[PDB]
């Protein structure tokens, strides 16, 4: 429906620290220039923290300590569209990146939020995960999964036997480790005696380095029960 | 900067109960006080405005009060979809701050983590690194302790502890922790162990291997 009111962002990503990125949100289902916009952003794992703000008219901007001096927030009111100029970048701007509508003609209290965007921030290169079986080996269930090691940047997705294996599957979030790489495991609890007769795979794909790498996950050779 | 001090850090209740979320103002803010809920991987959605009105739309359950620097959020009665994190924002000036965040979370009964121990794989190993995992399984409430052992010597530094958000069905929680060494440090050593405490074991639990063995 038109009446959707929808503020859909682009132009995150990858980038160096010292790197330079500008975001783009373009609205709509209402009339742009009416209304005070601002950009929230959100860390990993932590709270919400406002970054700037315009005006309707867009001549006066204003914006946190924390991104004062190397970021510039702007509109383009003829194109529905509203940035933020990200220079000087540092590791601790990784974030998702979130553009938002103020409520009212006074106040940046934010009403309609985009979906947001990963901005990643970090002298790694784009690498596919390596994939290590947790192998299996308690009330006749066994424990089994796959650890999704050293990958960059976030996310990776994990499915079982193709999305068929759902039931008892934990995925955890990841980590950034002192490489600057991430990690996660996933596990699936499942009947000990579907060990050796049931194949497990564990599906992962990561999208921004195109790789997809599916691991079986059996018991140890060495295991014989 | 106005500073926003949410109340408790996490409140844990059962559907149906009443939960009252608070949000304390360092100075006035003329009341424009603001409320959003946020579950994992979705984008905030507003609650309350600024003169503690019910945005439309929300539902009825949901309202806010306060004045001066002390402000409330209630639910009078909890649904299942309630359970979320709740933040509060002062929209009076510049710089806006919000609060630092109150998960509301599914009460349940005590369940006691079942524990489980990974050594490196072979494939791993030759690729030049060893991770040790020790999975804590389907636990409630969220506090557990996970220490390694490695030939008896407690270590620190070396390991990273992940959880998964509640289960959707049985609302437990699961917990990695994963032990990362070089494979030169993991060949120096022969017994492995996790030692978890929970409040649902009567006593600390510990799952080890000897990497001289299947």
């Known amino acids: 429906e038109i009446s959707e009111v929808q503020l859909v962002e682009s132009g995150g990503g990858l980038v160096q620290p010292g790197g330079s990125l500008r975001l783009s949100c373009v609205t709509s289902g209402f009339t742009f220039r009416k209304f005070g916009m601002s950009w929230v952003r959100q860390a990993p794992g932590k709270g919400l923290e406002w970054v700037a703000s315009?005006?309707?008219?867009?001549?006066?901007?204003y914006y946190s300590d924390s991104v004062k001096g190397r970021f510039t927030i702007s509109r383009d009111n003829s194109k529905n569209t509203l940035y933020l100029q990200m220079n000087s970048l540092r590791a601790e701007d990784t974030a998702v990146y979130y553009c938002?509508?103020?409520?009212?003609?006074?106040?940046?209290?934010?009403?309609?939020w985009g979906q947001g965007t990963l901005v990643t921030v970090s002298s790694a290169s784009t690498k596919g995960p390596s994939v290590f079986p947790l192998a299996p080996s308690s009330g006749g269930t066994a424990a089994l999964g796959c650890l999704v090691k050293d990958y960059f940047p976030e996310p990776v997705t994990v499915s079982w036997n193709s999305g068929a294996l759902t039931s008892g599957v934990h995925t955890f979030p990841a980590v950034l480790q002192s490489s600057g790489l991430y990690s996660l495991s996933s596990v699936v609890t499942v009947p000990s005696s579907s060990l050796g007769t049931q194949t497990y795979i564990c599906n992962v794909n990561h999208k921004p380095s195109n790789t997809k790498v599916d691991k079986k996950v059996e018991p140890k050779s060495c295991d014989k029960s | 900067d106005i500073v926003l001090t949410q109340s408790p850090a996490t409140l844990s209740l059962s559907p149906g109960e009443r939960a009252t979320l608070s949000c304390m103002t360092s100075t006035d803010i003329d009341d424009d006080m603001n409320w959003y809920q946020q579950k994992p991987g979705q984008a905030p959605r507003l609650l309350i405005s600024?003169?503690?009105t019910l945005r439309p739309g929300v539902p009825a359950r949901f309202s806010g009060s306060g004045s001066g620097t002390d402000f409330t959020l209630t639910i009078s009665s909890l649904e299942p979809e309630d359970f979320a994190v709740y933040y509060c924002?002062?929209?009076?000036?510049?710089?806006?701050?919000f609060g630092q965040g109150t998960k509301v979370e599914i009460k349940r009964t005590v369940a006691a983590p079942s524990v489980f121990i990974f050594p490196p794989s072979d494939s791993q190993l030759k690729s030049g690194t060893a991770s040790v995992v020790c999975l804590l399984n389907n636990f409630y409430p969220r506090e557990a302790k996970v220490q390694w052992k490695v030939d008896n010597a407690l270590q620190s530094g070396n390991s990273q502890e992940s959880v998964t958000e509640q289960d959707s069905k049985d609302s437990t929680y699961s917990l990695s922790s994963t032990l990362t060494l070089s494979k030169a440090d993991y060949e120096k050593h022969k017994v492995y162990a996790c030692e978890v405490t929970h409040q649902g074991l009567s006593s600390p639990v510990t799952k080890s291997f000897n990497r001289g063995e299947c």
């Open positions: 938002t509508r103020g409520y009212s003609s006074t106040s940046y209290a934010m009403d309609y």
């Open positions: 315009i005006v309707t008219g867009g001549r006066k901007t």
């Open positions: 600024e003169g503690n």
């Open positions: 924002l002062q929209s009076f000036n510049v710089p806006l701050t």
